[PDB]
Amino acid sequence: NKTVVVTTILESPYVMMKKNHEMLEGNERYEGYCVDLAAEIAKHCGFKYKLTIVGDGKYGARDADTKIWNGMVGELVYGKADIAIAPLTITLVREEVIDFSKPFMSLGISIMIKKGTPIESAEDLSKQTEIAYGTLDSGSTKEFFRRSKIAVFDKMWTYMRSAEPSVFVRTTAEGVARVRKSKGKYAYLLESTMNEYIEQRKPCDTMKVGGNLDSKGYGIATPKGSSLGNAVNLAVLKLSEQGLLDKLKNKWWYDKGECG
Amino acid sequence: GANKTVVVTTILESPYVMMKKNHEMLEGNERYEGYCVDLAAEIAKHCGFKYKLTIVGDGKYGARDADTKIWNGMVGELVYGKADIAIAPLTITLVREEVIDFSKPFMSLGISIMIKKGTPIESAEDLSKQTEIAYGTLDSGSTKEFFRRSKIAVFDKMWTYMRSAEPSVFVRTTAEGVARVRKSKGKYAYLLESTMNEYIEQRKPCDTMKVGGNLDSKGYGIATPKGSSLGNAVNLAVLKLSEQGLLDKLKNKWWYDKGECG
Ligand SMILES: O=C(c1ccc(-n2nc(C(F)(F)F)c3c2CCCC3)cc1)N1CCCC1
Ligand SMILES: N[C@@H](CCC(=O)O)C(=O)O
Ligand SMILES: N[C@@H](CCC(=O)O)C(=O)O
Ligand SMILES: [Zn+2]
Ligand SMILES: [Zn+2]
């Protein structure tokens, strides 16, 4: 009976540092959707755990030259952590090297603009140059554009891969800050979950425009063949059926909304 | 062993699997059309197998009898070795997951409310509070079970009503429920998955609609018998087809491109 090392990532409102965190220790420093979900998963599977924030601050991508994985994915693949409880997107390239539970949350890539920016769709972003746009580094959104053979998205990638200065950001907070200070000349492509949360926070100057560009899910990840996987998957399905996932989403998005 | 034809269990449920107009003069898989017919072809291509579509004998999705403990429906067909895979609008649930394997979901849905247009109902809450408008579910599936197991006040209360209502508010098929919404002049509302509600909303005579939010959020998965050698490849195939755009193209094809109500 070992303490399970949980890798996760600081990403609002999934895992955030509490306001008084420097006077707090271990798991108690953090709050958020995935902090509550970790507690619930651990209860139903019956383990003790330690939240650890991923060292390199990344979700996970595979370097094309070395084939080495970074981020939470790489922590699971190289045996640093036992489980990933995070907004980690289920993808085919990841599923090849790690296991995922059934999804605990739905999402899709979406567009974030500063309010009043004259963009309504991906198609709109793609037909112009005045408004720059990009995605997070080392995540599933960047890859979706990398891999897309849909004309509008292919054309969006061609611009993004070569744009100068770089349109890509290391963190969601960086991308969001860029939107907010670019006076409508930078739009950010990010997952609808993160977009809708931000929209409901002060200074209330961003919005999600248009529909989602895809539809997919976050799952709880474990190293390939790990013994936790079966229990974690049953636990996710249980929490889904009890209504707890829905309770948590409302708690962290809509109950803590501050743009009325 | 040498490669066997994969027996696929599915269910006649529009627009997932339907009989082609001219089915009597065709053979085998060519008799059927729809979303799950198209999806089966693709899953099979990408996993490298031959398959035979078969409609489940009892016309049911799958539930376990409380007394006999026997699983019926598509789930029965996989549990008892009569099929190798189910490709259908079969909901991923915990009880099912304990006896069969599911791929990651291929399509997202939630329980929702179907009314005849002009029915004075806007929510589950509305339905729970009142009595002139009867409501029920498909008599053997994930939706009925959702209500039988829910701890949420409005839904417990809905169940308490539905289980004891007479005449029965439960129906044998989705088509029966829709026919009942349509014939009951606003006095019956039907609780069914959003996907099916959304489809019917786009069909002549265009007299129904989905109202309110969805009551839950889940998915349909491709099912295999627990531990089957297909599970892995089918799962990777679902993910590839999601990431390429195929699932979205198929939903658009079968729901919206062929809609009859604008
Ligand atoms: O409401 C959902 C839900 C259901 C299904 C999905 N997922 N997840 C995936 C994928 F596995 F990521 F690819 C796909 C879908 C639907 C679209 C096809 C691919 C996403 C979210 N839940 C909330 C709690 C349980 C699942
Ligand atoms: N959820 C993403 C990170 C955010 C994004 O890529 O937009 C991932 O698992 O890689
Ligand atoms: N998709 C459901 C059947 C339809 C319903 O229950 O509303 C099942 O797998 O049981
Ligand atoms: Zn619990
Ligand atoms: Zn490199």
Which of A141, A216, A236 would best serve as a mutation to test chain B binding (most B beta carbons within 10 A)?
A: A216
**B87 half-sphere exposure, CB direction, 13 A CA radius:** 28
Number of helical H runs and strand E runs in chain A = 10, 11
- Contact B192 CB / ligand 3 (< 6 Å): yes
User: Strands of A98-107's sheet, edge to edge?
Assistant: A49-53, A4-8, A83-84, A216-223, A98-107
**A151 half-sphere exposure, CB direction, 13 A CA radius:** 3
Q: Which domains does chain A have, with CATH numbers?
A: 1-107+217-256 (3.40.190.10), 108-216 (3.40.190.10)
CA-to-CA dists, residue B130 to B125, B156, B187, B230, angstroms: 9, 14, 11, 48
Using what technique was this structure determined? X-ray
- Backbone phi, then psi, for B170, in 5-degree steps? -90, 150
**B115 half-sphere exposure, CB direction, 13 A CA radius:** 16
> CB within 8 A of B73, min separation 6: which ones?
B11, B56, B58, B60, B61, B62, B63, B140
Helix B153-164 / helix B142-149 crossing angle, nearest 10 deg: 110
Report every protein residue that has its C-beta within 5 angstroms of ion ligand 5: A 63, 65
Q: Is A28 helix (H, G, I), strand (E, B) or coil?
A: helix
> CB within 8 A of B63, min separation 6: which ones?
B71, B72, B73, B75, B140, B141, B144, B145
Which of B145, B242, B246, B252 would best serve as a mutation to test chain A binding (most A beta carbons within 10 A)?
A: B242
The DSSP call for residue B25 is G
In this complex, the residue of A92, A106, A237 whose CB is nearest that of residue B217 is A106
Cα A98 → chain centroid: 17
Q: Tokens for B180, please give them.
A: 């009942």
CA-to-CA dists, residue A16 to A158, A216, B166, angstroms: 34, 24, 52
Question: What region, left, alpha or beta, does residue B30 occupy, with left being phi > 0 and alpha being psi -120 to 50 degrees?
Answer: alpha
Q: Could you tell me the resolution of this structure in angstroms?
A: 2.2
In this complex, the residue of B102, B221, B242 whose CB is nearest that of residue A216 is B242
> CB within 8 A of A164, min separation 6: which ones?
none
Which one-letter amino acid corresponds to residue B46? H
CA-to-CA dists, residue B253 to A153, B2, B33, B38, B257, angstroms: 21, 36, 12, 10, 5
Q: How far apart are CA A78 and CA A72, in angstroms?
A: 10
Q: How far apart are CA A228 and CA A108, in angstroms?
A: 27
What ligand has the least distance to the C-alpha of A236?
Answer: 1
Composition of chain B by helix, strand, coil, percent to 5: 40, 20, 40
Q: How far apart are CA B35 and CA B211, in angstroms?
A: 24
Q: Which of A107, A72, A109 is nearest to A221 (CA)?
A: A72
Q: Is B232 helix (H, G, I), strand (E, B) or coil?
A: helix
Distance, CA B31 to ligand 4 centroid (Å)?
A: 46
Q: Tokens for B224, please give them.
A: 């295999």
N- to C-terminal Cα distance for chain A? Answer: 46
Q: Tokens for B69, please give them.
A: 């403990």
Q: Are B54 and B36 in contact (CB under 8 A)?
A: no
**A32 half-sphere exposure, CB direction, 13 A CA radius:** 22
